[PDB]
Amino acid sequence: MNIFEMLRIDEGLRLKIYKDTEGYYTIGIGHLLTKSPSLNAAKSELDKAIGRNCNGVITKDEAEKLFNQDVDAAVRGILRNAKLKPVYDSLDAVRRCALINMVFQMGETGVAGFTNSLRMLQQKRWDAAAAAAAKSRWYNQTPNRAKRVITTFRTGTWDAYK
Numbered sequence: 328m329n330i331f332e333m334l335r336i337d338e339g340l341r342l343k344i345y346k347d348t349e350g351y352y353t354i355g356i357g358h359l360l361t362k363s364p365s366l367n368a369a370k371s372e373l374d375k376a377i378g379r380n381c382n383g384v385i386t387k388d389e390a391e392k393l394f395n396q397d398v399d400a401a402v403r404g405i406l407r408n409a410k411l412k413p414v415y416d417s418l419d420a421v422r423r424c425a426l427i428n429m430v431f432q433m434g435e436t437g438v439a440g441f442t443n444s445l446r447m448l449q450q451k452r453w454d455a456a457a458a459a460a461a462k463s464r465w466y467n468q469t470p471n472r473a474k475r476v477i478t479t480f481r482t483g484t485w486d487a488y489k
């Protein structure tokens with residue numbers, strides 16, 4: 328299992344504009360288009376992001392190209408962030424993927440908000456980190472996804488995804 332396979336499971340793949348869990352216009356593999364209530368705003372974002380007039384529909388290749396960009400951006404973002412980098416550097420491979428997953432879903436700022444969880448991860452206190460992360464809006468809004476990511480942090484294995 329790898330980061331792409333993991334996120335493909337968590338996010339799914341849709342080739343037409345759709346609304347995410349929070350009601351936002353998205354496409355492909357979890358690619359947020361706009362927070363705006365406007366479908367026209369969504370279509371405009373999409374055309375800009377793809378480089379062609381898509382009329383709210385993309386190909387599989389196009390979805391995978393956005394996904395590659397998004398994963399790359401998440402990893403580089405982690406590496407540039409003063410609060411996230413040291414945690415990433417301290418973790419083993421599997422757990423690194425768990426962090427990239429979180430950043431992909433909530434952004435760098437959001438993840439950096441989990442102060443205590445990050446501290447616990449850095450100290451290798453797996454159960455404590457898991458318990459802290461569960462006390463969040465994130466966990467209450469998307470529990471199944473959260474539990475899979477938390478388990479990954481907890482065990483350092485891909486069990487939750489197999």
Ligand SMILES: [Cl-]
Nearest residue numbers: 441442443444
């Ligand atoms: Cl926390």
Ligand SMILES: [Cl-]
Nearest residue numbers: 461462463464
């Ligand atoms: Cl809570």
Ligand SMILES: [Cl-]
Nearest residue numbers: 469470471472
């Ligand atoms: Cl969920």
